[PDB]
Amino acid sequence: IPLLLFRWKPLWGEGSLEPSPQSQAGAWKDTAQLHKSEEAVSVGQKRVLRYYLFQGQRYIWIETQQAFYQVSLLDHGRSCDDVHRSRHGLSLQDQMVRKAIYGPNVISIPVKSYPQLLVDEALNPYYGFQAFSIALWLADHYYWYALCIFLISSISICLSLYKTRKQSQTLRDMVKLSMRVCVCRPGGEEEWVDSSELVPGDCLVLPQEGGLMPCDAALVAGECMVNESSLTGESIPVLKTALPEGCAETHRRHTLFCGTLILQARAYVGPHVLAVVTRTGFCTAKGGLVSSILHPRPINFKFYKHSMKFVAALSVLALLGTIYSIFILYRNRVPLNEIVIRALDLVTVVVPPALPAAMTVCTLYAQSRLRRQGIFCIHPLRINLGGKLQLVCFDKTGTLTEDGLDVMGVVPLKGQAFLPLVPEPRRLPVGPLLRALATCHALSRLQDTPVGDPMDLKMVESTGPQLQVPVSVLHRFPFSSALQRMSVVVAWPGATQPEAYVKGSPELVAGLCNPETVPTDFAQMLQSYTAAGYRVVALASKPLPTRDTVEGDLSLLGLLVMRNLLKPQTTPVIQALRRTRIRAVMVTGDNLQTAVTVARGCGMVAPQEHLIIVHATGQPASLEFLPMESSRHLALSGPTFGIIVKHFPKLLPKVLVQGTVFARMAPEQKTELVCELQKLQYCVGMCGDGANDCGALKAADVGISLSQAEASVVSPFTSSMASIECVPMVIREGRCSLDTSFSVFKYMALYSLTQFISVLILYTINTNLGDLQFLAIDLVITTTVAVLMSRTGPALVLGRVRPPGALLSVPVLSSLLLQMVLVTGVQLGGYFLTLAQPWFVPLNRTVAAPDNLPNYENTVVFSLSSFQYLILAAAVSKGAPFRRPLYTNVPFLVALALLSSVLVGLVLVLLQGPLALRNITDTGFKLLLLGLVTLNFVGAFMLESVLDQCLPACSKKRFKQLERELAEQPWPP
């Protein structure tokens, strides 16, 4: 010991590495390229046991000889025979050995009681300044403004208190539940252990009656089709095979995962299925996903990076005022303690102690016009990132196309003729064609709705007959995926013998049909449909007087048509995006030529534009550049994207700058596609809910999830409108809320500084401003203007220009400085003009600062000053490009006008008991004063307009560079 720095911690975290290395001397150290702070160990259970957690992975390594990190399964070069060598459960001695290295199978959360949370939220370097300012004002003033800043801060800490507890309470009501699930023991026992005490080395014998899931296991013996609703999005039973003998990511369909509610539980070898454990709840699939959203990505926005840097220029403009102020305030011979309280007030007048609150009010107003609109947002500062989007990547299942299938009709065939597609199957008369597809099903007529496969529900309502003239006699062959067809034996009254109504895949069934029935125009009609983005099955029949006698030399009646139609409001939106110079992309877990006819329809790839298929081949060979005919775009595939991301990484930025359609994308292959496009220095946006959205959604910058009301397993935008009509009104709520976070920050810097200038042009002559006056100014004119200002509203037409986002650049600084030369000027011009006036008498200087108050210089400086705050506020809020014109903000205009009228009245008339003004001004030059304030109004608006036209005639973001580059030399050679 004797290395504790507690004696130096009682006399006071900018650099965490330069402080922990002095407070503490391979033991309890963790520093490798990322934030260097998780320093603990356990070393229990009479072993080495390198325990330390970082976000849920123990990294079990103290050295390289007898230690190696990445505890997730620890044996990545494993054999598929090894899980077949270990079908039996692990021995009870060894069961409490693997539990000591691995986790306790609970991805838990801390409790985080109130002292704790509070402390964290408060000890931050701004709320210290709101505990130095309140304790400085209370020595004089206060009472009113201090109570108000303290209350506003308390509600600013009690809202983050209850919002952060509810994030923990919602995740606690999630997984880490308890469930008894029997195992196989060391030798043939069950014991019904809990689902949170099994480790890799054991097995699972799952009960077929009920159970949610314990864990992810390798199916050593069995076969099932589990409910995949919470795992891969597809709520249908997904066929999951057993593991063959001889890399569990390659054996995806061979291993069953966590969250799998079992449906079949088919043993087919013996009494019960056997599945041996692979991982544990700490680092498994969906065990890592819940822990991933507990440590989110930081919103690396350059707007906030120049907002915490511009205050640190106001934190040095104070120190060039509180040296001068001491000198002047002493020269006039104050008795001392006031010199100190005064220089300190100057510090609180020029660093605005409620600037944070105004920024929060602007964003709160945001949410309140999205939650009324329909879009639900949970993270407020993500809304500002929505306007600076230059890439929007879409899904297609339930995002652009309709989620479920439908039908255009049947294309029958009577003697090799191809009578055309019927738009509605009730129109053509009754026969074997419409008795078949209305009855060729194995649906469950149960509780008023047939429940089964998605696509075969829609064929029933297409012609819409009654259901129970025929009746379901017997299903001789249930639909398996190996034969790609299903036969239904059915009879009806009025017939002599039943017929074998059968549907199935076109080429595999019609070859089994009669060749005198199927024509030679069967192949050409097939790729006339499936190349236009259609799903197609064929239908046949044969009379019957079981086995496959019902399926042989059939009579192929015709083809059936299925397709995923677009939503009615996804065509005029994709035109609305790429007319505003931001370009859309689809990512797709379906077939390629399905997702090309969508992009030609909705408007990703417009007509009279080129597109090129990329197919590059396992082997590192060439690209082959396949075209299509029907700017520049190019479509590519899933495994093609895996080749050129590794074999050609120097050729990759000339493909993702033009890549529009990404098909066959794996659910993990999407989250680097949304990440390679972030180190090309775009600002991406995901928008889609469906099967495979989960991995790339949080890794994006603005992720919208459709067709769900309120959920927290999401990137922080979750619309409840089920269309991509929301993605304009999220990038239109990041432009009227990022060009508002200028107009509140700028008014604030300008107010602080007009107050600094007045308090200074008025510490000279020893005539400090008075208390009700400062209160009036701050509370009234700055709680009203800021609050009311932040609610103007969004526009109706999206523009080709983006907000700047950088508020240290010349335009902001220049407006502040010019508007300020005009403000100093009006306040000083006023002081000099009040002086040279013939009735004027000077202030009794050799008295004191706040008993020198029924006089004149303070009356003139305070009047010119209040009008200025209101004029600067109206000037710094303009709405021609982005938000809305100002006259639609009725509350504000009414306030500006009423405050302005109370102030004009103070000037031209009586508030002279309060506000400590000069008793009356006799002569009629109160009018020149009013004129100086009019010159200032015209002044501010004109200056701001002239500066708004600032064409400083005197392409670094990578995408821009590439585009120029490609434009010179295209790249699809």
Author numbering: 60 to 71, 113 to 125, 140 to 360, 365 to 582, 610 to 613, 620 to 696, 708 to 779, 784 to 796, ...
Relevant lines from the article:
ATP13A2 belongs to the orphan P5B adenosine triphosphatases (ATPase) family and has been established as a lysosomal polyamine exporter to maintain the normal function of lysosomes and mitochondria. Here, using single-particle cryo-EM, we present the structures of full-length human ATP13A2 in three distinct conformations including an E1 state (apo), an E1P-ADP state with ATP and Mg2+, and an E2-Pi state with SPM, phosphatidic acid (PA), and phosphatidylinositol(3,5)bisphosphate [PI(3,5)P2]. The structure of the human ATP13A2 adopts the typical P-type ATPase fold with overall dimensions of 125 Å × 75 Å × 70 Å, including ten transmembrane (TM) helices and three conserved cytoplasmic domains [N (nucleotide-binding) domain; A (actuator) domain; and P (phosphorylation) domain]. In addition, the P5B type ATP13A2 also comprises two specific domains: a C-terminal extension domain (CTD) laying close to the P-domain and an N-terminal domain (NTD) preceding the A domain showing amphipathic feature.
To investigate the possible SPM translocation mechanism of ATP13A2, we added SPM, PA, and PI(3,5)P2 during protein purification and sample preparation, and ultimately, we solve the structure of the E2-Pi state at a resolution of 3.6 Å. Comparison between this state and the E1P-ADP state reveals a door sliding motion formed by TM1 and TM2 accompanied by the rotation of the A domain and the tilt of the N domain. The conformational change in TMD creates a spindly negatively charged cavity that allows substrate entry from the lysosomal matrix. The SPM molecule is stabilized by extensive interactions between the amine nitrogen atoms groups from SPM and the acidic and aromatic side chains along the cavity. For instance, the amine nitrogen atoms are coordinated by D254, D463, D960, and D967 via hydrogen bonding interactions and by W251 and F963 via cation–π interactions. In addition, human ATP13A2 contains a narrow tunnel ― formed by TMs 1, 2, 4, 5, 6 ― than that of Spf1, due to the spindly character of the spermine substrate. The binding manner of the SPM substrate in these two structures is highly conserved. The E2P to E2-Pi transition is accompanied by the rearrangement of the A domain and the binding of SPM molecule in lysosomal lumen to the substrate cavity in the TMD of ATP13A2, thereby facilitating the dephosphorylation reaction. Interestingly, the E2P-inhibit state of Ypk9 reveals a long N terminal loop that interacts with the A- and N-domains and hijacks the ATPase in the E2P state. Such an auto-inhibition regulation mechanism is not observed in our current human ATP13A2 structures.
